[PDB]
Design an enzyme around this catalytic site. Sequence first.
Site, short mmCIF file in Angstrom:
data_model
loop_
_atom_site.label_atom_id
_atom_site.label_comp_id
_atom_site.label_asym_id
_atom_site.label_seq_id
_atom_site.Cartn_x
_atom_site.Cartn_y
_atom_site.Cartn_z
N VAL A 1 14.57 15.22 -5.24
CA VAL A 1 12.91 15.41 -5.67
C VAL A 1 13.12 16.73 -6.24
O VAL A 1 13.95 17.02 -7.05
CB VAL A 1 12.12 15.62 -4.54
CG1 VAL A 1 12.04 14.15 -3.75
CG2 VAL A 1 12.57 16.83 -3.35
N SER B 1 18.43 23.06 -5.55
CA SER B 1 18.11 21.59 -5.42
C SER B 1 17.47 21.17 -4.23
O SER B 1 17.81 21.98 -3.00
CB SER B 1 19.55 20.98 -5.44
OG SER B 1 20.53 21.43 -4.45
N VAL B 2 16.26 20.24 -4.26
CA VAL B 2 15.73 19.95 -3.00
C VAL B 2 15.98 18.58 -2.83
O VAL B 2 16.05 17.69 -3.75
CB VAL B 2 14.23 20.28 -3.30
CG1 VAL B 2 13.45 19.87 -2.08
CG2 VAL B 2 14.13 21.74 -3.57
N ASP C 1 7.09 28.67 -3.50
CA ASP C 1 7.81 29.16 -4.65
C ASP C 1 9.13 28.63 -5.18
O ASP C 1 9.90 28.83 -4.30
CB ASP C 1 7.90 30.85 -4.63
CG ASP C 1 8.33 31.40 -5.91
OD1 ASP C 1 8.69 30.56 -6.73
OD2 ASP C 1 8.11 32.51 -5.89
N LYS D 1 15.84 22.11 1.12
CA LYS D 1 16.06 22.86 0.05
C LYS D 1 17.50 23.50 0.27
O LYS D 1 17.54 24.18 1.10
CB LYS D 1 15.13 23.96 -0.13
CG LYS D 1 15.60 25.21 -1.31
CD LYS D 1 14.48 25.93 -1.57
CE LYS D 1 14.86 27.45 -1.76
NZ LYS D 1 15.59 27.92 -2.86
C1 LIG Z 1 11.57 31.59 -3.89
O1 LIG Z 1 11.55 32.43 -2.52
C2 LIG Z 1 10.29 32.16 -2.03
C3 LIG Z 1 9.66 31.22 -1.06
N1 LIG Z 1 10.41 30.05 -0.78
C4 LIG Z 1 10.16 28.93 -1.03
O2 LIG Z 1 9.01 28.50 -1.79
N2 LIG Z 1 11.16 27.76 -0.80
C5 LIG Z 1 10.83 26.55 -0.90
C6 LIG Z 1 10.21 26.04 -2.44
C7 LIG Z 1 9.62 24.56 -2.39
C8 LIG Z 1 10.28 23.68 -1.47
C9 LIG Z 1 9.78 22.20 -1.81
C10 LIG Z 1 10.36 21.45 -2.88
C11 LIG Z 1 9.84 20.20 -3.12
C12 LIG Z 1 8.83 19.58 -2.39
C13 LIG Z 1 8.46 17.99 -2.44
N3 LIG Z 1 7.48 18.10 -3.71
C14 LIG Z 1 6.09 18.57 -3.34
C15 LIG Z 1 5.10 18.31 -4.45
O3 LIG Z 1 5.34 16.84 -4.81
C16 LIG Z 1 6.76 16.63 -5.47
C17 LIG Z 1 7.68 16.75 -4.48
N4 LIG Z 1 8.45 20.43 -1.41
C18 LIG Z 1 8.75 21.60 -1.02
C19 LIG Z 1 11.02 24.08 -0.31
C20 LIG Z 1 11.53 23.17 0.90
C21 LIG Z 1 12.24 23.72 1.76
C22 LIG Z 1 12.37 24.99 2.13
C23 LIG Z 1 11.98 25.89 1.07
C24 LIG Z 1 11.28 25.64 0.10
C25 LIG Z 1 8.25 31.15 -0.84
C26 LIG Z 1 7.59 32.47 -0.96
C27 LIG Z 1 6.08 32.64 -0.66
C28 LIG Z 1 5.97 32.63 0.92
C29 LIG Z 1 5.52 34.04 -1.15
C30 LIG Z 1 5.21 31.21 -1.27
C31 LIG Z 1 8.15 33.25 -1.99
C32 LIG Z 1 9.21 33.44 -2.34
N5 LIG Z 1 9.96 34.49 -3.03
S1 LIG Z 1 11.14 35.32 -2.53
C33 LIG Z 1 11.21 35.19 -0.75
O4 LIG Z 1 12.34 35.04 -3.10
O5 LIG Z 1 10.65 36.67 -3.01
#
Ligand SMILES: COc1c(NC(=O)Nc2ccc(-c3ccc(CN4CCOCC4)nc3)c3ccccc23)cc(C(C)(C)C)cc1NS(C)(=O)=O
EC number: 2.7.11.24
Length: 330
Positions: free
Chosen positions: A26, A27-28, A158, A43
């Site tokens: 959807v 690397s994830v 993010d 992820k």
């Molecule tokens: C980059 O690291 C960060 C993350 N991590 C992060 O967002 N990681 C992830 C981001 C996105 C998905 C993800 C991807 C695709 C989909 C499915 N999509 C959903 C939408 O529709 C299409 C399919 N769902 C979830 C993930 C899945 C599992 C584990 C982690 C995931 C979060 C945050 C906040 C708490 C401030 C928001 C800051 C940072 N910054 S930092 C710590 O480095 O300072």
Amino acid sequence: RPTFYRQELNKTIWEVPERYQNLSPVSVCAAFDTKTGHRVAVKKLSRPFQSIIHAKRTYRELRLLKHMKHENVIGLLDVFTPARSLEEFNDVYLVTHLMGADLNNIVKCQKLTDDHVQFLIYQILRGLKYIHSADIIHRDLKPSNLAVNEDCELKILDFYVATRWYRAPEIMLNWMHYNQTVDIWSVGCIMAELLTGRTLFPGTDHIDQLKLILRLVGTPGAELLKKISSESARNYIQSLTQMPKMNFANVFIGANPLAVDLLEKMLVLDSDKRITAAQALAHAYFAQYHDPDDEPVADPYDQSFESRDLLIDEWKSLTYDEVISFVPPP
Ligand SMILES: COc1c(NC(=O)Nc2ccc(-c3ccc(CN4CCOCC4)nc3)c3ccccc23)cc(C(C)(C)C)cc1NS(C)(=O)=O
């Protein structure tokens, strides 16, 4: 220890516990968690320890994700690695609930009701208040980083839509001393887009972005101009504010007056004068959802590691510790 199984998805090797089935890119990867019957997002970090910069970033994300426990913020459901020891530890897998779609794939259908906008923006702010109370700044708030479900419930995340279009001016001018309201600016651009149907500041290069912004929020005032040390920076922002000004009312005609009032409070050039998530949540525009007793803050977050310069192997061991010390929530 669980029993893992290998597989290749788009020339990418994935080794995860049998618990997670039917992996889909959807690397994830989207998957089906057999322990609950719910779909999750998995992820896999690229090359987590390839460099000291990657290693620390890996650690940074694990720690932050391990600490996030809020309805409107991505939370960690599970974290694992096929490695049976620190010696062979080389991959990190993070898991969260799978969400329906972005806020991007939800506006490409029709202009949302003002009530729909109230609820979505309310949730962003509720989540942002939480993240900000942990001394954390998003810096890349935008529709693609917003996950919403069939119930219109929102979660902020993010991915490691245009960042710049929602980017605060002080960041594109490299003023380095960014405050948290940098995210409030992004929220303002997002809300504007949800109400008007169009990108508020659709610039090409950042210069074009800045120009479009200043023509709307106005030339930097005396009060703001005094906080800029650099003279070339002071002059530069003035040079960029030479386009025929525009007004708010105009750009958001039709919208709820409470809505345009809040936008005028988020889209303020001087970051020291922007309304905060907490204050914003109390704005009358959200009278319908605001609840002072269900808008939680976070437990003190220890990020003393940020001011640390360590060797890759040190970052790797600290990260490994975090992996094995993970305990899933109820
Ligand atoms: C980059 O690291 C960060 C993350 N991590 C992060 O967002 N990681 C992830 C981001 C996105 C998905 C993800 C991807 C695709 C989909 C499915 N999509 C959903 C939408 O529709 C299409 C399919 N769902 C979830 C993930 C899945 C599992 C584990 C982690 C995931 C979060 C945050 C906040 C708490 C401030 C928001 C800051 C940072 N910054 S930092 C710590 O480095 O300072």
